[PDB]
A paper describes a structure:
RNA guanine-7 methyltransferase (RNMT) catalyses the transfer of a methyl group from S-adenosylmethionine (SAM) to the cap intermediate to form the cap m7G(5′)ppp(X) and the by-product S-adenosylhomocysteine (SAH). RNMT was identified based on homology to the yeast and viral homologues and in vitro activity. This basic cap structure (cap 0, m7G(5′)ppp(X)) protects RNA from degradation by nucleases during synthesis and recruits factors involved in RNA processing and translation initiation. RNMT has an activating co-factor RNMT-activating miniprotein (RAM) clamped at the interface of the catalytic domain and the modular lobe 416–456. Consequently, RNMT is a target of interest in cancers and immune disorders.
HsRNMT–Sinefungin–GMP-PnP, HsRNMT–SAH–DDD1060606 and HsRNMT–SAH–DDD1870799 co-complexes were solved, respectively, at 2.5, 2.0 and 2.4 Å in space group P21. The two inhibitors (DDD1060606 and DDD1870799) identified in the screening campaign were successfully co-crystallised with HsRNMT in the presence of SAH. DDD1870799 is also observed in the cap pocket of RNMT. In the presented structure, the pyrazolo-pyridine interacts with Y289 via two aromatic H-bonds, while the fluoro-benzene is buried in a hydrophobic pocket made by the residues including the main chain R173, as well as the side chains N176 and Y467. In comparison, the MIFs calculated for DDD1870799 suggest that the fluoro-phenyl moiety is responsible for the ligand binding via the interaction with a small pocket (S3) of high hydrophobicity. This interaction, by displacement of disorganised water molecules, is likely to be responsible for the significant gain in net enthalpic change ΔΔH measured for DDD1870799. However, a significant gain in net enthalpic change ΔΔH of −1.9 kcal/mol was measured for DDD1870799 in comparison with DDD1060606, suggesting that the interaction of DDD1870799 with HsRNMT-RAM is more enthalpy driven and might result in more selective leads with fewer absorption, distribution, metabolism, excretion and toxicity issues than DDD1060606. We report the structure of two small molecule inhibitors of RNMT as result of a diversity-driven hit discovery campaign. These molecules behave biochemically as uncompetitive inhibitors with respect to both cap and SAM despite the structural biology data leading to an expectation of competitive inhibition with cap. The biophysical data resolve this puzzle by demonstrating that the compounds require the presence of the enzymatic product, SAH, in RNMT to bind efficiently.
Numbering used by the authors:
A (entry chain B): 170 to 246, 252 to 419, 456 to 476
B (entry chain A): 167 to 415, 418 to 419, 456 to 476
């Protein structure tokens, strides 16, 4: 519960930074693509951003319905929203938008990207889906496990495994970290245990250039927290959310991750 | 200096590597063994090839002054009484990240059983087209079943020492590494300076070895193994020949091991 809340604060400040930048740029028709939305934990964040149109997509059809339902519920207590079930690493989302020439101001992709580094075609496909329809000046923002921190911990271990009572990471073998299909197990004890894939961030950065994007920043969770905490509204939100200090086991689990922000060039 | 001791330790590491794949080549075929020493320098492995009893060697390096020194060292070797069987050699000055070596061989159709690239291939990661071209020169003319072997800095260990560093610099009295910015490690062009006290002050580029691995597939190569300098040493010491050899050439100082431990060895095999 406490980790889920900490990560929402991270996502809130990240989305909020770039929602603000879009609002200084655009005058109307703010449109967002939430690639890998899950059950919809960011719907509230997009409503607070006063955006105009949301596309929500995930590979789990059950998650897409729950996300749709949560939207309908909050509509009836707002942006227009679309809900598409699809593998964004194998399908073109352009094939499924109500309007196949719509463009986006932000693609947000939270804890989703690394599942596409199963293979070259899949990672390229998810990037296309996240950046191809970005308007000039648009943003591709997200969160994903920091490959360096995962390799560092795996080396320093004895087993192909490290973790604690919250999380366990088991690698399929050691010393072999292919650009694609480097598989490992992320055991969220006991929510989910999902196959994940390593993302060498310099690879992702170079790949995004195919879609005319440039790095805005790449920040470990630590860096992101330390910089974003100095802001006042960010600190206000942290207290208003019930958040103080992470426990050591929770810090270890969440320091695995980094945040990234790219921007569509002209 | 104690550069003398590092050189002799590095020569052991290269002997053990060269030897493993020479013996693999010697068995897969009966015949003449032909070798590409890419970035040969002054010819510090010429003796390793003479003990390997190979039949044809090609030495190439971007530095013409070093190529001539390597040729000069080869001709002195053949003035000895124990060089009846010594390989024949040709010496070419060329930028192997820019020029096609195929158009400079005496025989433009010749083929290699081994391309040996020791402490060279990281200079080519200046750009993609240079890393690609050095790999073409190293692997395209390899016979099927041939080998691409070498040594190069372990980028994971450079970045670990950098991140952990207090400034953009780390080293000791033997070496110093200075990057240009922390956090920004591009696939190509990641420049850092490498100063080996008294020996050499050169710019180098980071090689993400997984990227090197993938790019080598384009020339139909497959990884045989990659081992850090430590990992390689501990496995190879177990064999008595390797160890007897290590002692015929003491143990390593602290600041010396810190300097050699940045490196990894690799071996690729050309597929059929
Ligand atoms: N190939 C793929 N295409 C689209 N979504 C995928 C996917 N692979 C995994 N996912 C989705 O990515 C999600 C990861 S959990 C992240 C959920 C949400 N964005 C949040 O931050 O709370 C899961 O819902 C999973 O179904
Ligand atoms: N682009 C390039 N093409 C060919 N050789 C290069 C090169 N860039 C650097 N080199 C050579 O690589 C050498 C690295 S020093 C290594 C020397 C030798 N291989 C040995 O192990 O003893 C230098 O002599 C340098 O001239
Ligand atoms: O929300 C986060 C952030 C986070 C939370 C706690 C941590 F300890 C570290 C990170 N996630 C990263 C880890 C797995 C999370 C998750 N829950 N359910 C899933 N189903 C899937 O199919 C794929 C992923 C998940 C998604
Ligand atoms: O032999 C090794 C291995 C090694 C030696 C000592 C160590 F402490 C650890 C490793 N080298 C790596 C370091 C630079 C060496 C070198 N000497 N002269 C050069 N000229 C150039 O143009 C480029 C590189 C060099 C080559």
């Amino acid at each position: 519960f406490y980790l889920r809340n900490f990560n929402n604060w991270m996502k809130s400040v990240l989305i909020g930074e770039f929602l603000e930048k879009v609002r200084q740029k655009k005058k109307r028709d703010i449109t967002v693509l939430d690639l890998g939305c899950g059950k919809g934990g960011d719907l509230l964040k997009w409503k607070k951003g006063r955006i105009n149109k949301l596309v929500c997509t995930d590979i789990a059809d059950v998650s897409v319905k729950q996300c749709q339902q949560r939207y309908e519920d909050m509509k009836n207590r707002i942006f227009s929203a679309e809900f598409i079930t699809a593998d964004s690493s194998k399908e073109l989302l352009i094939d499924k938008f109500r309007d196949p020439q719509m463009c986006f101001d932000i693609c947000s992709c939270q804890f989703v990207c690394h599942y596409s580094f199963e293979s070259y075609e899949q990672a390229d496909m998810m990037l296309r889906n996240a950046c191809e329809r970005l308007s000039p000046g648009g943003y591709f923002i997200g969160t994903t496990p920091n490959s360096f921190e995962l390799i560092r911990r795996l080396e320093a271990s004895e087993t192909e495994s490290f973790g604690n009572e919250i999380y366990t990471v088991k690698f399929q073998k050691k010393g072999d970290y292919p650009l694609f299909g480097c598989k490992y197990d992320f055991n969220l004890e006991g929510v989910v245990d999902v196959p994940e894939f390593l993302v060498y961030f310099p690879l992702l950065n170079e790949m995004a250039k195919k879609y005319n994007m440039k790095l805005v920043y790449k920040k470990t969770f630590l860096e992101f927290y330390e910089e974003k905490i100095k802001n006042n509204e960010n600190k206000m939100l942290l207290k208003r959310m019930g958040l103080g200090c992470l426990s050591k086991s929770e810090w270890e689990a969440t320091s695995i991750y980094l945040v990234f922000a790219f921007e569509k060039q002209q």
